[PDB]
Amino acid sequence: LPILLDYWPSMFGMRARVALREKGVEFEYREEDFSNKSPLLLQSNPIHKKIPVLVHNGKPVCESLNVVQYVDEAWPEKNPFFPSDPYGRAQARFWADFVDKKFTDAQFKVWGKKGEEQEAGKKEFIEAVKILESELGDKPYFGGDSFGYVDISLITFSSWFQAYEKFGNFSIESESPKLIAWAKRCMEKESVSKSLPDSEKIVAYAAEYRKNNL
Amino acid sequence: LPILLDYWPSMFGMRARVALREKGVEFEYREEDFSNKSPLLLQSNPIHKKIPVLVHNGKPVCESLNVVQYVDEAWPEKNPFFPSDPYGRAQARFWADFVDKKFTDAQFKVWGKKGEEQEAGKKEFIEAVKILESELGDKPYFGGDSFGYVDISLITFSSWFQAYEKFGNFSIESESPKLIAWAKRCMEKESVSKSLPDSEKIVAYAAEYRKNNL
Amino acid sequence: TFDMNRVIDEFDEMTRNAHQVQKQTLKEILLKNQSAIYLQNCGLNGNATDPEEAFKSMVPLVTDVELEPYIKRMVDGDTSPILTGHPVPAISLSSGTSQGRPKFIPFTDELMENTLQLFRTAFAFRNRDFPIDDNGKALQFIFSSKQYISTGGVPVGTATTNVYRNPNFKAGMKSITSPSCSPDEVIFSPDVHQALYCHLLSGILFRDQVQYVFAVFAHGLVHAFRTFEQVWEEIVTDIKDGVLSNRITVPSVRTAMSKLLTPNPELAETIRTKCMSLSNWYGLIPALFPNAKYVYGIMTGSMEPYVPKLRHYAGDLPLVSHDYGSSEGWIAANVTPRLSPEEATFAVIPNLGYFEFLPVSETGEGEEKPVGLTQVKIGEEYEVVITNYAGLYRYRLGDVVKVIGFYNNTPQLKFICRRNLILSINIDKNTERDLQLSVESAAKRLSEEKIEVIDFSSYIDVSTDPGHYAIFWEISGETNEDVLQDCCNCLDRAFIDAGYVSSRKCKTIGALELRVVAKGTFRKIQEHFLGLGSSAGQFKMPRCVKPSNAKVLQILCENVVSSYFSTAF
Numbered sequence: 001l002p003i004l005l006d007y008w009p010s011m012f013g014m015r016a017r018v019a020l021r022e023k024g025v026e027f028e029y030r031e032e033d034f035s036n037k038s039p040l041l042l043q044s045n046p047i048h049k050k051i052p053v054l055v056h057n058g059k060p061v062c063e064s065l066n067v068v069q070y071v072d073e074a075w076p077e078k079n080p081f082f083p084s085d086p087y088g089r090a091q092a093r094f095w096a097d098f099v100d101k102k103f104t105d106a107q108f109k110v111w112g113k114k115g116e117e118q119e120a121g122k123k124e125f126i127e128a129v130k131i132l133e134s135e136l137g138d139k140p141y142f143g144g145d146s147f148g149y150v151d152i153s154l155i156t157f158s159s160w161f162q163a164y165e166k167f168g169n170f171s172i173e174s175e176s177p178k179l180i181a182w183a184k185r186c187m188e189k190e191s192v193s194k195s196l197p198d199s200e201k202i203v204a205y206a207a208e209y210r211k212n213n214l
Numbered sequence: 215l216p217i218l219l220d221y222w223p224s225m226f227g228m229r230a231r232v233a234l235r236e237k238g239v240e241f242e243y244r245e246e247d248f249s250n251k252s253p254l255l256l257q258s259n260p261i262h263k264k265i266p267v268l269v270h271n272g273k274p275v276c277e278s279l280n281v282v283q284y285v286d287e288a289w290p291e292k293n294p295f296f297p298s299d300p301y302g303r304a305q306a307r308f309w310a311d312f313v314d315k316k317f318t319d320a321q322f323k324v325w326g327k328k329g330e331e332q333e334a335g336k337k338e339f340i341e342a343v344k345i346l347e348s349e350l351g352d353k354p355y356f357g358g359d360s361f362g363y364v365d366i367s368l369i370t371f372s373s374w375f376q377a378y379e380k381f382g383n384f385s386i387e388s389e390s391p392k393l394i395a396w397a398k399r400c401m402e403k404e405s406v407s408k409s410l411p412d413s414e415k416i417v418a419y420a421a422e423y424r425k426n427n428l
Numbered sequence: 429t430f431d432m433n434r435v436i437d438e439f440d441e442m443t444r445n446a447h448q449v450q451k452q453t454l455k456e457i458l459l460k461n462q463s464a465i466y467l468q469n470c471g472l473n474g475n476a477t478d479p480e481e482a483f484k485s486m487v488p489l490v491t492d493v494e495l496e497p498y499i500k501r502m503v504d505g506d507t508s509p510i511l512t513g514h515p516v517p518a519i520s521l522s523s524g525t526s527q528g529r530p531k532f533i534p535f536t537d538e539l540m541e542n543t544l545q546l547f548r549t550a551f552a553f554r555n556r557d558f559p560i561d562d563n564g565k566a567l568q569f570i571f572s573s574k575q576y577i578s579t580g581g582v583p584v585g586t587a588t589t590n591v592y593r594n595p596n597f598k599a600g601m602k603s604i605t606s607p608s609c610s611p612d613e614v615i616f617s618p619d620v621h622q623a624l625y626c627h628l629l630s631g632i633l634f635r636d637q638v639q640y641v642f643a644v645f646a647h648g649l650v651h652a653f654r655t656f657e658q659v660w661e662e663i664v665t666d667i668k669d670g671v672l673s674n675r676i677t678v679p680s681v682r683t684a685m686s687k688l689l690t691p692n693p694e695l696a697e698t699i700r701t702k703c704m705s706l707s708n709w710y711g712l713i714p715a716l717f718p719n720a721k722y723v724y725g726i727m728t729g730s731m732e733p734y735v736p737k738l739r740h741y742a743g744d745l746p747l748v749s750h751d752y753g754s755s756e757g758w759i760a761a762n763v764t765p766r767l768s769p770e771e772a773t774f775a776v777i778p779n780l781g782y783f784e785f786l787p788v789s790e791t792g793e794g795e796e797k798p799v800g801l802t803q804v805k806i807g808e809e810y811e812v813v814i815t816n817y818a819g820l821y822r823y824r825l826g827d828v829v830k831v832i833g834f835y836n837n838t839p840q841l842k843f844i845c846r847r848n849l850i851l852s853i854n855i856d857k858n859t860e861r862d863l864q865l866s867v868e869s870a871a872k873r874l875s876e877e878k879i880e881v882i883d884f885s886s887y888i889d890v891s892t893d894p895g896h897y898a899i900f901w902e903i904s905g906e907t908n909e910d911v912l913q914d915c916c917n918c919l920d921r922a923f924i925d926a927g928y929v930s931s932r933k934c935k936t937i938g939a940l941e942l943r944v945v946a947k948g949t950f951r952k953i954q955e956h957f958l959g960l961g962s963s964a965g966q967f968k969m970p971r972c973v974k975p976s977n978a979k980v981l982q983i984l985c986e987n988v989v990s991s992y993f994s995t996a997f
């Protein structure tokens with residue numbers, strides 16, 4: 001059994017749990033204390049000391065996109081996250097990185113900041129969301145005909161959409177119901193219905209992170 | 215014929231050039247004036263407007279590391295950059311992510327900024343080249359038993375090594391030698407020996423950058 | 429940006445680039461749709477190099493019945509994406525009926541571009557043949573006043589509703605239409621029959637510089653001119669005193685006419701002296717605006733017979749035929765509009781879908797496989813199937829078309845058609861005869877007012893507890909609530925079956941709501957449908973709505989000219 005060192009509000013951690021559970025893999029979930037990080041995480045990651053990291057075959061694999069690609073690659077016989085063609089796995093990667101960087105910074109300043117960046121970031125969020133709806137054109141999912149790579153990349157950001165609708169104070173549903181409803185399309189599936197923790201609690205911890213630092 | 219959108223001192227454009235030339239493609243380079251980003255680039259990435267851009271079947275392939283695995287997958291028969299196991303792939307990808315974060319930014323700090331910013335960047339890069347040195351351990355390369363994925367990723371920084379040594383007024387070699395040492399080793403590959411421009415010029419572009427923003 | 433010459437050569441070479449632009453459009457449409465579930469079931473994934481080969485041989489053809497549940501699943505609370513992707517901002521309907529039940533179809537902003545772009549063209553071909561003044565106006569008997577919200581809290585709507593109050597309508601159509609007579613408020617007036625009256629009044633209002641009259645259909649025109657025919661004495665009077673007729677009751681739009689109105693007595697002397705000299709309103713369309721370059725609308729297919737009563741209205745003024753398309757996907761444009769209605773044909777526009785045709789060539793019908801768009805045979809008739817942004821993939825709409833010629837490398841289509849008809853049996857009934865009889869029974873309470881009932885529709889609403897059916901109505905003129913309330917009772921009192929007797933008397937299904945709608949409503953489901961991309965077999969309106977109906981539904985809620993739940997019961 002593979003061991004997951006994760007963080008319950010971590011969306012990237014949510015990437016790993018969604019992927020492994022999206023297949024048919026039985027794995028053990030471990031809560032990390034970032035004040036008291038397990039001997040397992042420091043011996044698995046002595047540098048960034050980051051989650052998520054999964055040990056399989058006595059081997060630690062770290063980074064969310066990297067753990068998930070590792071999942072596709074180690075158990076590829078049922079539900080592939082990738083389409084068969086080079087350019088299309090390339091277009092899941094292109095948008096994986098998009099969700100991962102510019103989109104994840106924009107959202108990070110949504111829940112993590114006050115004033116100027118909060119607002120201009122609300123923009124950014126409305127903008128990046130605006131592009132991702134556009135290229136998807138009309139796909140129920142993302143990375144292939146079923147649950148994909150870039151969809152697991154973004155679905156974890158469903159459990160923060162509601163935090164973003166209070167601190168960013170928008171309704172991306174009433175300016176783009178397209179996206180959260182991928183997310184709720186994707187919520188009919190059990191990798192999302194039992195991996196992504198409760199929406200309210202994310203709001204709680206997002207607001208409480210806001211409480212702890214000024 | 216593969217059309218690459220490149221920029222003479224792009225470590226990232228070099229990632230693409232080293233990748234392709236490492237594989238076995240005959241391709242064409244076009245030099246960019248980022249003041250006038252080309253019609254076909256502004257069609258390739260109308261928002262980032264960023265290179266390297268390799269164009270195949272009339273489909274733009276973007277982002278440096280995205281572009282080099284593109285290289286792997288476009289011609290999968292002769293020169294693989296990854297080894298056969300999913301684990302090793304994840305470690306190489308892991309370490310490619312390493313090259314791209316604290317390492318790139320720290321170098322950006324050592325030649326691009328000064329003073330309070332500078333030494334922060336200087337301890338950061340010596341730290342980086344040290345974890346680096348530790349993981350290079352012994353191996354001729356990085357991402358497999360031969361010329362690898364991330365070999366491509368970080369070799370292209372070794373022509374900027376000169377600019378780092380001079381503005382830093384350092385010597386990144388007596389603190390971590392096997393690295394630069396591995397780098398002029400990696401210079402013998404015809405992929406990097408002909409894709410990378412001269413370092414006095416690269417130094418000089420850092421000098422133009424510096425002289426502009428003091 | 430709208431211009432004449434540079435757009436049309438793009439299009440000439442677009443029309444000659446016919447095959448790559450659709451194969452591209454198909455491969456666009458696949459690359460934007462790689463994630464579609466039915467395709468997983470079909471075996472698809474991306475680029476390949478037999479993709480068009482893989483497509484026509486691996487993905488099966490489909491019907492309204494089979495498509496209902498998927499786009500149904502999109503709409504009801506599960507906001508979830510299926511045969512398109514993105515839960516679409518709107519859903520559409522198809523004329524005729526899915527074994528008699530309603531069908532659902534996804535709408536994306538792509539369609540809005542489709543609308544705009546082919547019109548950007550379309551105005552350019554007609555203004556080529558009928559050049560227009562850049563400071564004039566047009567009379568538009570057009571409406572988009574209505575917006576319901578589906579059972580899932582999801583918007584699903586007509587081409588109409590979706591185009592005019594789309595955020596992109598105003599900026600986009602501003603450079604390709606002579607400014608509308610009507611302030612948009614009266615266009616989206618909750619009462620489009622009082623809005624009509626004001627609409628005909630609006631186009632009547634800025635006539636001297638008016639370049640054309642328009643409706644999608646010339647029956648939008650002859651019914652507008654049969655509406656016109658029903659209302660201009662009162663039009664003199666309401667306009668004369670600078671006080672609008674007491675016929676109008678809606679205060680937001682009444683505010684819109686009051687900001688416009690003041691007392692002016694000479695002018696009436698005039699209107700009355702013109703329209704008289706005719707022998708019954710032959711060439712009225714140039715009477716109203718002697719300077720309209722044309723009368724624009726679809727004039728082929730299911731309704732050749734009112735081009736003559738409109739020619740009758742239009743006189744010797746040229747009668748110009750409208751381009752073809754729908755919410756399901758647009759097809760073909762008359763890039764030579766100067767052509768007569770009977771000989772009028774329309775050329776396909778390239779990136780709005782990927783198109784295929786089933787031949788009728790054998791007897792009836794024919795077991796042969798579809799051929800490509802440039803592979804169609806001249807003079808011969810094929811039925812169109814559609815692959816596009818509207819959630820339809822090699823979809824058999826069910827309509828037979830004739831090929832008349834080629835505009836450079838692109839073909840010109842003809843429609844001799846009318847009804848896409850074979851039916852089957854259902855569950856939105858309450859026998860169609862019963863529902864028609866319901867309207868008939870209750871509507872003669874309105875007939876006491878010198879009124880007839882022009883058309884009707886319905887809706888099953890099972891979000892509410894209990895659920896209630898919603899009966900819909902288009903009448904020829906305005907009246908008061910008491911009689912309409914009475915009317916709803918009679919619709920309840922007219923479904924004569926033993927069954928729903930147990931139902932509503934037990935109220936396990938809650939009281940019938942009659943939302944009476946305003947004029948042009950069922951005219952717009954029509955105006956939607958002949959233009960629809962297929963063939964002219966597009967006119968049997970579905971009469972009662974399961975949750976799977978869409979074109980009549982956005983129409984239903986916001987033009988509640990009144991809405992009532994039965995006081996009996």
Ligand SMILES: N[C@@H](CCC(=O)N[C@@H](CS)C(=O)NCC(=O)O)C(=O)O
Pocket residue numbers: 007010011012013034049050051052062063064
């Ligand atoms: N980009 C990396 C870094 C992730 C990262 O920084 N994660 C946060 C939690 S989501 C964390 O673990 N921070 C460690 C800390 O607070 O020092 C990844 O996605 O794994």
Ligand SMILES: N[C@@H](CCC(=O)N[C@@H](CS)C(=O)NCC(=O)O)C(=O)O
Pocket residue numbers: 221224226248262263264265266276277278279
């Ligand atoms: N993450 C990028 C790094 C590229 C980068 O920094 N590119 C610079 C080359 S100097 C660039 O193209 N900047 C675009 C601009 O500022 O116009 C990639 O690998 O594509």
Ligand SMILES: CC/C=C\C[C@H]1C(=O)CC[C@@H]1CC(=O)O
Pocket residue numbers: 542543544546547587591643644750751752753754955956958959960
């Ligand atoms: C393209 C503009 C969208 C609106 C379309 C409607 C009109 O403006 C007239 C009909 C047309 C629909 C049709 O051709 O089927």
Ligand SMILES: CC(C)[C@H](N)C(=O)O
Pocket residue numbers: 586587588589591644754952953954955956957959
């Ligand atoms: C009016 C137009 C947008 C469309 N054909 C409809 O009637 O729905």
